[PDB]
Amino acid sequence: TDTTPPTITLPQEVIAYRGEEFEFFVETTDDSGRVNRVIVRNIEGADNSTYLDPNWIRYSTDNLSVPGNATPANPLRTRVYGIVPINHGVGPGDRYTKYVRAEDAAGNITALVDKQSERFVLVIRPQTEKYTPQVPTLTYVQNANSLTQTDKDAVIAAVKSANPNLPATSTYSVSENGTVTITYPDGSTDTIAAAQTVDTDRVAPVFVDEGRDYIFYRGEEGTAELHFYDNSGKITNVNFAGDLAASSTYNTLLGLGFTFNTPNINNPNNATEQNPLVTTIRGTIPKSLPAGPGGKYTFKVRATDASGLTSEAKIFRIVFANQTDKYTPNNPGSLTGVLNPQQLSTSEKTAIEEKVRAANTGNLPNNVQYVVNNDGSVTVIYPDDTPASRSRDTITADRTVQDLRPRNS
Ligand SMILES: [Ca+2]
Ligand SMILES: [Ca+2]
Ligand SMILES: [Ca+2]
Ligand SMILES: [Ca+2]
Ligand SMILES: [Mg+2]
């Protein structure tokens, strides 16, 4: 018969955090494959005692005293579990050594020896020992010695966002200098140093497109996309009317019916190097403005971050261009026969214009005009053509005309 008590396996030490649930399993086996009782108790008391305290240490064994319930491949599982009260002490003496016993169907119970038989030490620790807070991304503030409330709110936001796995009911406070104090549900705390949360914003926004020339073709609507970023990731204002000289050409463009749109200007994190703030200028330089030496508008732009640093005015230009700079006529697919190359007839000119037209649909503007000259060369006149700024192309006669005169003898 069986004279051997079951074998108990369990962790010698379980760290339990105040205000949280804890759980671990005792595993029990026996040669018979059956265990009838599994007990957790305090050391004091008679051999038959199962007295156990405090009331929040709990345990249960679902499958007691059934055959085959306690084998090496499938041991009997005893659940030890509870919730540590929020106000429990967390001194070095706030620990519990509890004794675990098991008894087989033949009545063989494991011996109970103070400080030596099967036991576990449940150690109650503050919630701050479980959690290690992650540094947030830095908040760039006007004055790292005296944070505003919006500064504080932002630091809390970046702490939370970087620490999703802290207890949801944790509370955050930010000092006048940005030092973060995290208070856990049990009142224990953690600190994130001011050096790790904030710095004073010392860098003004950057205009990526400084010095750039944006070409606008006369009579064709165009766009110019200007890009800006800031070390803080955030720009609050973009300004083109810094001084009189810059403000007058800005207002000149607006009077031509241009628009300036910066749709993300009020979004947070709207201005990083990887995802810059974009201002788009849209409009048409009308043909009444000529291209040439003074055919430019020169602008100055400044950008301001949320801490009030404004960049040094930087320059960009819109440069006027004739449409002919953009287009190249295709030559006719065939030449046109002409009886006298020095003076084309009407029907010859009409036939040349048709071939040039057909050769350039989908290439030149639909509203280009062609003049077939007396020598059969062809003047291509773009819609922006004016006397002060001609926009034109010439197709030479050797590409359009073919002499039909017969050869001598
Ligand atoms: Ca046994
Ligand atoms: Ca901690
Ligand atoms: Ca800045
Ligand atoms: Ca051209
Ligand atoms: Mg208008």
Numbering used by the authors: 252 to 660
Tell me, in the authors' exact words, what the paper reports.
The serine-rich repeat (SRR) adhesins are a family of bacterial cell-surface glycoproteins containing two sequence motifs where serine constitutes ∼50% of the sequence. The binding region from S. sanguinis strain SK1 (residues 252–660 and termed SK1BR) differs from structurally characterized Siglec-containing binding regions in two ways. First, it contains two copies of the Siglec and Unique domains in tandem (SK1Siglec1-SK1Unique1-SK1Siglec2-SK1Unique2) with sequence identity/similarity of 39%/56% between the two Siglec domains and 44%/50% between the two Unique domains. The second way that SK1BR differs from other structurally characterized Siglec-like binding regions is that each of the putative Siglec domains of SK1BR contains a noncanonical YTRY sialic acid–binding sequence motif that lacks the central Thr-Arg deemed to be critical for binding in other Siglec-like adhesins.
To develop hypotheses for how SK1BR binds to sialoglycans, we began by determining its X-ray crystal structure using molecular replacement methods. The tandem repeats of unliganded SK1BR fold independently, and slight angles between the domains yield an elongated and overall arc shape. The limits of the domains can be clearly distinguished as SK1Siglec1 (residues 252–377), SK1Unique1 (residues 378–453), SK1Siglec2 (residues 454–573), and SK1Unique2 (residues 574–660). As is anticipated from the amino acid sequence conservation, the individual Siglec domains and Unique domains exhibit structural similarity, with RMS deviations in Cα position of 1.058 Å between SK1Siglec1 and SK1Siglec2 and 0.639 Å between SK1Unique1 and SK1Unique2. We identified disproportionately large structural deviations in the CD, EF, and FG selectivity loops that surround the putative sialoglycan-binding pockets, which contain different numbers of residues, with the FG loop of SK1Siglec2 being so short that it is effectively absent. In the CD loop, this also manifests as a difference in secondary structure in which the CD loop of SK1Siglec1 lacks secondary structure, whereas the CD loop of SK1Siglec2 folds into an α-helix. In addition, the CD loop of SK1Siglec2 is displaced from the binding pocket when compared with the CD loop of SK1Siglec1. Together, these differences in loop length and structure result in a larger and more open binding site as compared with SK1Siglec1. In the unliganded state, we observe that the selectivity loops have elevated temperature factor values as compared with the V-set Ig fold that forms the core of the Siglec domain, suggesting that they have increased mobility.
